Design a protein around this ligand. Structure first.
Ligand SMILES: Cc1nc2ccc(-c3cc(N)nc(N)c3)nc2n1C[C@@H](C)Oc1ccccc1
Ligand SMILES: [Cl-]
Length: 335
């Protein structure tokens, strides 16, 4: 009865899958850990709700994951592997490889003090390769929901990660969903109602990486106006050439007589561009909250490269925003 399937720990499906537990949920449905008695391995089964909206999203998810599996390249291994799909008890079921917990849960283990710059660089290098892969012309996939919860550790002690959840993804040129991106990771072009391309995922990556190192969201907007005000505190008023073409410019900004833009009044924020990323990362002051002072792997030089790469990912202009190939060449990654 209704959308959400009946899940009893210890039960068995198709004399194959042995349901140990429920390992997650979201608007799409639920994920169960089950033992596949046939080829003797644990799997994560994403159970889709029996509503058209979610069936339709999952069907796109299946097409895009099946498209990625056609390519011979080591880079595709930064995306969760879809083993097979089938219908069961009137529900689409997507069988995935079993991974470990997400990057939010990793931050929770550190009590939101953040992981080391050295771990941040390993995640960044994997996320940038994953994005390079999604930008292969034949794929041109925009994930449109990058956040710490959709990045999973393969293994609880190792650094290897994968991206999951292509339910709200599309290909370059498509406009399907009214609202896209999780609010904290939502690019300015999407807030402004402007056309979006693969650059929106790079914006999200920049936000994710700062949060992974400091332990808190860079831009924790409670609504769209608060999101845009929080981005403006750090990066200043967006360029006139963007605001002149943006359908939703007047939701956040006013054009003055002289033709310069500034913020609408609210009905309290630090002045535009004064909440410097240099101070949020603590480049010269021992890292976030001073907690990495002395500690190896946390030099002013290491922090300067990190800061510089992040600001290239958080460029307001999606045409000049850094692209995955060029991000992988950044001195931040130099071996
Ligand atoms: C432990 C584990 N292995 C997994 C392997 C794959 C997936 C998964 C794959 C796809 N395409 N979409 C989703 N929403 C999950 N989820 C796994 N999970 C559960 C949790 C940790 O991830 C979650 C991530 C997001 C939501 C809920 C759980
Ligand atoms: Cl709003």
């Amino acid at each position: 009865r209704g959308s959400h399937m009946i899940v009893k720990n210890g039960e068995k499906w198709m004399d194959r899958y042995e349901i140990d537990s429920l390992i997650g949920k979201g608007s799409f449905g639920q994920v169960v850990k089950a033992y596949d008695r046939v080829e003797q391995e644990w799997v994560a089964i994403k159970i889709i709700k029996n509503k058209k909206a979610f069936l339709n999203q999952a069907q796109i998810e299946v097409r895009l994951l099946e498209l990625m599996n056609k390519h011979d390249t080591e880079m595709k291994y930064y995306i969760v592997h879809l083993k097979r799909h089938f219908m069961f008890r009137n529900h689409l079921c997507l069988v995935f490889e079993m991974l470990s917990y997400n990057l939010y849960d990793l931050l929770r283990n550190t009590n939101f003090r953040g992981v080391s710059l050295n771990l941040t660089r390993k995640f960044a290098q994997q996320m940038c390769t994953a994005l390079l892969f999604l930008a292969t012309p034949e794929l041109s996939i925009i994930h449109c929901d990058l956040k710490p919860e959709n990045i999973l550790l393969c293994n609880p002690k190792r650094s290897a990660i994968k991206i999951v959840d292509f339910g709200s993804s599309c290909q370059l040129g498509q406009r399907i969903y009214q609202y896209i991106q999780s609010r904290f990771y939502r690019s300015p072009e999407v807030l402004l109602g402007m056309p979006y391309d693969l650059a929106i995922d790079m914006w999200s990556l920049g936000c994710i990486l700062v949060e992974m190192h400091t332990g808190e969201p860079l831009f924790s907007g409670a609504n769209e106006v608060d999101q845009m005000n929080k981005i403006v505190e750090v990066l200043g008023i967006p360029p006139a050439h963007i605001l002149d073409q943006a359908p939703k410019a007047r939701k956040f900004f006013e054009k003055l007589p002289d033709g310069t833009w500034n913020l609408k009044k609210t009905k309290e924020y630090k002045p535009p561009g004064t909440r410097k990323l240099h101070n949020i990362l603590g480049v010269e002051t021992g890292g976030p909250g001073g907690r990495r002072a002395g500690e190896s792997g946390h030099t002013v030089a290491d922090y300067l490269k990190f800061k510089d790469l992040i600001l290239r990912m958080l460029d307001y202009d999606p045409k000049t925003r850094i692209q995955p190939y060029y991000a992988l060449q950044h001195s931040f990654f130099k071996k």
